[PDB]
Design a protein around this nucleic acid. Structure first.
Lengths: 124, 56, 129, 180, 262, 141
RNA sequence: ACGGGGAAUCAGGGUUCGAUUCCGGAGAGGGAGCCUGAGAAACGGCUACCACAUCCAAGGAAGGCAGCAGGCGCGCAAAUUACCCACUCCCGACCCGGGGAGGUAGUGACGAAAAAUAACAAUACAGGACUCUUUCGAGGCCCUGUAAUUGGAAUGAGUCCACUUUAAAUCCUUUAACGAGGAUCCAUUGGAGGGCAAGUCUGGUGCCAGCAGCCGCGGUAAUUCCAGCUCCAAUAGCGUAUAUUAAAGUUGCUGCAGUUAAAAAGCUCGUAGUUGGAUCU
């Protein structure tokens, strides 16, 4: 009844300033353990703060014993913000996407196309 | 070629309701019942080859 | 007119074997006829034969052992590749245990088993079983 | 243009004559013996065996020392031996044509679960498998048609979360003990 | 129709990229460069599909725009840049150098080379011509024009050039007995010694090659790339030494390796 | 007899191609005259408007009155007599309504004792005749 | 009739199909002519005419969904006026912007794969099973089941929690809480004369209504219609209509036939075509 965290694959990616791994999670009687717990365990295992660790794509095997996912451990938080996708940063709370929609932006652009000069900045 | 008679027999036939019966099994259980009735039950057959719906 | 003297020779042999005769006279003779008869005789189907030399085109008297069921020609002589040989044997032979297809290959005239041994396809001449 | 794949394949063939007594009796015998759901499972195993026989025949037409015949024949013989339908001693292409449909139906997880004593009957085996009570090695298997390999034959256990090989009582037992 | 195409369908891509069909509709259409579209390896394929340094094309773009990748000693920021036969890929940050060499199955192997061997490459010359006031020129398979070549260098020979200076260091003549590599066709990726060349005027020449284990094969002259003088190579060969194994021996080696290692 | 020569491929091919026109099915399916004469025009089904109800007498060996409807197809305006299969089903059909009509099962041939009828009614007023017959659905108001 | 890769049975040979995601071509309502540009006779460029068609203050102006969605029409015949650039790639002056390409989606039975609708009694029974001593008598040793007297155990369909999944998300997977005894959490579709598996059982109808692919059934004791019961075929799938393949050795190259069943020209020359005697180490 203790969650076990393993790392099958491992590579030091100096090009993107991170360590990439596949993560095995053993939760025989528990649900799919949250990514925050996996990040805490990986932080304890690899001796770093958990805000440089991004984990994603966790799929639980049929039967409920093991879950397999991917993880990154960046050298610093700055490199994480530089290299991570914006949606993973938003998951960690380090990024916020626009509140607009595709339809709104497209229609605004097409309306702007109909005017010339500084008047383009006066539509919405 | 008179069309006046049309559905006459389905009209004049006495209406008999369907009797309520225990539901029949489905899937593997129905096949198991068929197999047991036809190959595990030997008592009815003494060698005269009677049909499963012979009412005479 | 008489074309394909091999067809006449094989038909005469087949007809004489059906009638139960001990010898058949084949005319005219030819090199291909002699080679086909030699292939037949190596397999014990036909026995010894003698080539009568008239000064125009030989005749052959063939002793007949009662072992032959059918000898036939294939006309036209289709070119047969080594990958199409099995289909020809299924079409022509009574079984895979006995019976031979006689091909003519650049390595000579021989049966299909030898043609597969020598890795040669050729042109189908006939068959016998 | 899509990033999908449309490679699909029907796994059975319907008999040419819909109603003939001998085939019906034989297939019902097979269903009753191995606890199958319908004639389609019989036809599926029949189709598997027919494809295997077709491959073995086409190999047997080839030259005995043909590299492709040797390679694919050894591959097919190894595949048949691995799942335990063919004896290791008789590993030749001609012994493939001696295989019967029952040799393949004996290797289903249903048959192996019933034969190892884990179930009272073949139908109890089917419901045990479908109810997630059975695992092969460490993996819970839910498909009764699972063709058990030779190396996984000795690893068909009674799972670890099921009340039969685990220890947590089920819904009915918990509810009835809660009414004590 | 109407000018050049800019897309490449994933199933129309070269099969030696080992791309899978469910990832997307498109494959990275390699940009124009020193190597042909069908016999190159885009930098994104090498960095993502082979080396697994990146998971998406965006990460390949980040790696390339960090100016970390050097092809033939030059920094290349184009992620679809066509890298081809004998091209040297040097990643200084991780301190490894690769040479694009065909493996025996006709695919570009991940062949790691020492930094000393990353300072040169072998180039098969495609044509020699004289132009601009009697100055001889030399065109290679790498689309490099080298002025003032040695008069003994003729077509189908392979020169060795230093990458830093881009000048010819040595060359191997095309002759029987010289080691060669096949860069196209059924025998692509195989290494052997040239035994005989058949000349067919007005058509393609045929070169016959024999392996170290005596296997003999043939291919068109355009597919021959001589590696070294005699039977020794001037470059380091991949894990397989150019020997093509039949499927029987491949299976036997795989089974033996499975048995020995647990 | 037939020609057996290595260069007789053209003769065999042309003879087969000419002799195929003496096959009834081949000529029917490739001449295109049976296609233009087909009221459905190659379609499996068609929608028409019921012009009237007609009862056609059965063929001689047995006696009955077959409840049919004369319908006019929408696609081409052709007039069609279609059999209304089950009993009482003629009462489910009203004059001047849409009906879906299929073939009778013999590919343009008359079926059974019904003379000169090769079409049958499948749906009337966009509800199947079987649902109306079995009471699963009622005629729309 | 867009071509091809290719698709529908395997005896061998073939017969059909290929608008359709990959390659090549063509077209953007029909023609025609052009500008720019490396590349267009480009149409989400322009200029005319032809056919339709929008606003108008009647002077004029503006059009091209065989792009994604959506409408109408045509029909036997085909989906949402949704979300997103997170993936695959493409484009740009660009690591940053954009992409109805493409990716992702509450009613898609086109079709393909896996797979529930149940698994285990004391009991009387028609039983049988290793020498059963008895037609009047051990039959949870082995099995079947008329069951208005039984019993516990198992589980997922479903409803919900935890956001695993993902660019916010649904789905599968995972864990919890409920969730089965007419386990009413109730399987259907076509048949029961033959071909062809399965009732000359009962009631009604009485050549009527209807059934019937074909042969036939029905004219007051219908094995066939309309129904009840029972039975069987496949089964979350079955029926029907068409086109097509095998069956068709009823198109026959393999491999048909031509005296009388359909069939050799009234006869003979004859060019092309097809075929052509032995013989060379």
């Amino acid at each position: 009844d203790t969650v076990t965290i393993r790392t099958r694959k491992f590579m030091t990616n100096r090009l993107l300033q991170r360590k990439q791994m596949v993560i095995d999670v053993l939760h025989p009687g528990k649900a799919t353990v949250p990514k925050t717990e996996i990040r805490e365990k990986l932080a304890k295992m690899y001796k770093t703060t958990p805000d440089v660790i991004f984990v994603f794509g966790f799929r639980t095997h049929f039967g409920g014993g093991k879950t397999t996912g991917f993880g990154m451990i960046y050298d610093s938080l700055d490199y994480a913000k530089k290299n991570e996708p914006k949606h993973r940063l938003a998951r960690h709370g380090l990024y916020e996407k626009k509140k607009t929609s595709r339809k709104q932006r497209k229609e605004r652009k097409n309306r702007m196309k109909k005017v010339r000069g500084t008047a383009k900045a006066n539509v919405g | 070629g008179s069309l006046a008679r049309a559905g006459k027999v389905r009209g004049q036939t006495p209406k008999v309701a369907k009797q309520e019966k225990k539901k029949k099994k489905t899937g593997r259980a129905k096949r198991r019942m068929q197999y047991n009735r036809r190959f595990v039950n030997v008592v009815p057959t003494f060698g005269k080859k009677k049909g499963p719906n012979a009412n005479s | 007119v008489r074309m394909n003297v091999l067809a006449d020779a094989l038909k005469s042999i087949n007809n004489a074997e059906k009638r139960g005769k001990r010898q058949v006279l084949i005319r005219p003779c030819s090199k291909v006829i002699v080679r086909f008869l030699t292939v037949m005789m190596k397999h014990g189907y036909i026995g010894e034969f003698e080539i009568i030399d008239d000064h125009r085109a030989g005749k052959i008297v063939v002793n007949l052992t009662g072992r032959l069921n059918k000898c036939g020609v294939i006309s036209p002589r289709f070119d047969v590749q080594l990958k199409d040989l099995e289909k020809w044997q299924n079409n022509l032979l009574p079984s895979r245990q006995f019976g031979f297809i006689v091909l003519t290959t650049s390595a000579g005239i021989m049966d299909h088993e030898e043609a597969r041994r020598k890795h040669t396809g050729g042109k189908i001449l006939g068959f016998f079983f | 243009p899509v990033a999908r794949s449309w490679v699909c394949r029907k796994t059975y063939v319907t008999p040419r004559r819909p109603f003939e007594k001998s085939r019906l009796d034989q297939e019902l015998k097979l269903i009753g013996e191995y606890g199958l759901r319908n004639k389609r499972e019989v036809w599926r195993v029949k189709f598997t065996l027919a494809k295997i026989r077709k491959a073995a025949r086409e190999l047997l037409t080839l030259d005995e020392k043909d590299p492709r015949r040797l390679f694919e024949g050894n591959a097919l013989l190894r595949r048949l031996v691995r799942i335990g339908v063919l004896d290791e001693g008789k590993m030749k292409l001609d012994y493939i044509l001696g295989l019967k449909i029952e040799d393949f139906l004996e290797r289903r997880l249903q048959t192996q679960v019933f034969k190892l004593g884990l179930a009272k009957s073949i139908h109890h085996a089917r419901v045990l498998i479908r109810q997630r009570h059975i695992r092969v090695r460490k993996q819970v298997v839910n498909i009764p048609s699972f063709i058990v390999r030779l190396d996984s034959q000795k690893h068909i256990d009674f799972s670890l979360r099921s009340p039969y090989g685990g220890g947590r009582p089920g819904r009915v037992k918990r509810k009835n003990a809660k009414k004590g | 129709a109407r000018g050049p195409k800019k897309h490449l369908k994933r199933v129309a891509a070269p099969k030696h990229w080992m791309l899978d069909k469910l990832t997307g509709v498109f494959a990275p259409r390699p940009s124009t460069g020193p190597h042909k579209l069908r016999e190159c390896l885009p930098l994104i394929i090498f960095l993502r599909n082979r080396l697994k340094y990146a998971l998406t094309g965006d990460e390949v773009k980040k790696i390339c725009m960090q100016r970390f990748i050097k092809i033939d000693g030059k920094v290349r920021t184009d992620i679809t840049y066509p890298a081809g036969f004998m091209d040297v890929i040097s990643i200084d940050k991780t301190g490894e150098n690769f040479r694009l060499i065909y493996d025996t199955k006709g695919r570009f192997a991940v062949h790691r080379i020492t930094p000393e061997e990353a300072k040169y490459k072998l180039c098969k010359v495609r044509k020699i011509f004289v132009g601009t006031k009697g100055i001889p020129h030399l065109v290679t398979h790498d689309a490099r024009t080298i002025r003032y070549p040695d008069p003994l260098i003729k077509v189908n020979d392979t020169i060795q050039i230093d990458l830093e200076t881009g000048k010819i260091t040595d060359f191997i003549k095309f002759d029987t007995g010289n080691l060669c590599m096949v860069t196209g066709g059924a025998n692509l990726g195989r290494i052997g010694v040239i035994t005989n060349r058949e000349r067919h005027p007005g058509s393609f020449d045929v070169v016959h090659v024999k392996d170290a284990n005596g296997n003999s094969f043939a291919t068109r002259l355009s597919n021959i790339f001589v590696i070294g003088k005699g039977n020794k190579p001037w470059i380091s060969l991949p894990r397989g030494k150019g020997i093509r194994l039949t499927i029987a021996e491949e299976r036997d080696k795989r089974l033996a390796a499975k048995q020995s290692s647990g | 007899g037939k020609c057996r020569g290595l260069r007789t491929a053209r003769k065999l091919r042309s003879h087969r191609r000419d002799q195929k026109w003496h096959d009834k099915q081949y000529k029917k399916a490739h001449l295109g005259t049976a296609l233009k004469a087909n009221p459905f025009g190659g379609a499996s089904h068609a929608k028409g408007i019921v012009l009237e109800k007609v009862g056609v007498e059965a063929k001689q060996p047995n006696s009955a009155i077959r409840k049919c409807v004369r319908v006019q197809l929408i696609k081409n305006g052709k007039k069609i007599t279609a059999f209304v299969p089950n009993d009482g089903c003629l009462n489910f059909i009203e004059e001047n309504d849409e009906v879906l009509v299929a073939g009778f099962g013999r590919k343009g041939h008359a079926v059974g004792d019904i003379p000169g009828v090769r079409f049958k009614v499948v749906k009337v007023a966009n509800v199947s005749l079987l649902a109306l017959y079995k009471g699963k659905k009622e005629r729309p108001r």
